[PDB]
């Protein structure tokens, strides 16, 4: 198969600027037979340009795309709201069909820093036999964050998990939640919970944490 | 102009074969190749294969040998068989069709998609813990599958709270996870209700102090 590697991987850019994406072939792909369509999140893909330059009906004449060869290029000269989403390029010069990894794009704001909490197990939780020790931060951008656990200082390591909110149609940020997941027995034996937080916002690294039982 | 739905079952156990089906209400179901493509959630898209009203299919070699694509002209319907699944093939599965009989393999017309789970668990609707701060409070859902979750924040003196924020669902052993939190400014407590095709649950949250 034909792979296609599509760059930048994410795109911050602002309402009314430019964009303009790459879609490089392993090969050189028949005819042009190339073609770009957009995604929203929870939506069918939609049918942008066909043919490596043909655009489709009701489609605005902001959006062309050009290339021949192994590098075809999706240009959208003038950013406007509905315009943030995920776009990917396919080729049918030959089979079997592919497409490639999609490049999103989103909008760029002054960074903004997280508000961190943290959140202890419930006595409920405890009742059953595991624990879930929750930390979360919240409105910051850009995107990228890391989060560190640390229990009696010793940075621990492969049982937490994160999930990351899209961004926020009102203000622009991401939020994102972790979870430490240890069984009954461990969280009873140790004493200082600790979520550590850097973000390029931030000059130095945040913590928050509790002690067992005061709470 | 052309309209297409979807249905089939949606939650497997490892090694059971996928059915999905796909009617087409709309033009002339007659030269067109009708294709099935999938999505894993996160990941991009995949072509699997392609059939047309005579019976003459083209496959993804990668998938090639667990496949099968037919079509039934009597209803215009056309389907997808996928023999024994692993957890790799959980993934929205979209039908769609070119254009034009006689051109590039791209596709203008779509269906809305069916997610398909694959897991060894087994149905089961979520249980509830609180999240007290120790303003923001926050609830737990826990143990659930499918992933189909919703969630809705209310007042002691019922009333819809706003101030609200979810995050998406995380898999851990076969089953899901997920929180969602409340960002507030007498009452002694604030409720967290949950929705899910196994049953809707209800838990109040207490305010710290
Ligand atoms: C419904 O409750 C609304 C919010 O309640 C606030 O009340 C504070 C006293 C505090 O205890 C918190 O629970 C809430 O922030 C309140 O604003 C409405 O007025 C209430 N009643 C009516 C008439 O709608």
């Known amino acids: 198969e034909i792979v296609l590697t599509q760059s930048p991987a994410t795109l911050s850019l602002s309402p009314g600027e430019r964009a303009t994406l790459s879609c490089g072939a392993s090969?050189?792909?028949?005819?042009?037979?190339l073609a770009w369509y957009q995604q929203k999140p929870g939506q069918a893909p939609r049918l942008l340009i066909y043919d490596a330059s043909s655009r489709a009906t009701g489609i605005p004449d902001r959006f062309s795309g050009s290339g021949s060869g192994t590098d075809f290029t999706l240009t959208i000269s003038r950013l406007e709201p509905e315009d943030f989403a995920v776009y990917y390029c396919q080729q049918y010069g030959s089979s079997p069909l592919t497409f490639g990894g999609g490049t999103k794009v989103e909008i760029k704001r002054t960074v903004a820093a997280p508000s961190v909490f943290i959140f202890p197990p419930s006595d409920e939780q405890l009742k059953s036999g595991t624990a879930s020790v929750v930390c979360l931060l919240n409105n910051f951008y850009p995107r990228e964050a890391k989060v560190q656990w640390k229990v009696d200082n010793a940075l621990q390591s492969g049982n937490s998990q994160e999930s990351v909110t899209e961004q926020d149609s009102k203000d622009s940020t991401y939020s994102l939640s972790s979870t430490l997941t240890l069984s009954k027995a461990d969280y009873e034996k140790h004493k200082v919970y600790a979520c550590e937080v850097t973000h390029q916002g931030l000059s130095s690294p945040v913590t928050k944490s509790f002690n067992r039982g005061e709470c | 102009e052309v309209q297409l739905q979807q249905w089939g079952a949606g939650l497997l156990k490892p090694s059971e074969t996928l059915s999905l089906t796909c009617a087409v209400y709309?033009?002339?179901?007659?030269?067109?190749?009708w294709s099935w493509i999938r999505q894993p959630p996160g990941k991009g898209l995949e072509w699997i294969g392609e059939?047309?009203?005579?019976?003459?299919?083209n496959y993804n070699p990668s998938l090639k040998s667990r496949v099968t694509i037919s079509v039934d002209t009597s209803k215009n319907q056309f389907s997808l068989k996928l023999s024994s699944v692993t957890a790799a093939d959980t993934a929205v599965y979209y039908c769609a069709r070119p254009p034009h009989d006689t051109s590039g393999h791209y596709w203008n017309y779509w269906g809305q998609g069916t997610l398909v789970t694959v897991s060894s668990g087994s149905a089961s609707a979520p249980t509830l813990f609180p999240l007290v701060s120790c303003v923001a409070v926050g609830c737990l859902a826990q143990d659930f599958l499918p992933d189909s979750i919703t969630f809705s924040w209310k007042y002691k003196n019922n009333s819809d709270i706003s101030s609200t924020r979810g995050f998406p669902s995380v898999l851990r052993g076969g089953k899901y996870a997920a929180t969602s939190q409340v960002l507030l400014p007498t009452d002694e407590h604030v409720v967290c209700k949950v929705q899910h095709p196994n049953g809707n649950k209800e838990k109040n949250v207490p305010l710290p102090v």
């Open positions: 059939i047309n009203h005579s019976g003459s299919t």
């Open positions: 709309g033009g002339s179901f007659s030269d067109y190749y």
């Open positions: 090969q050189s792909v028949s005819s042009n037979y």
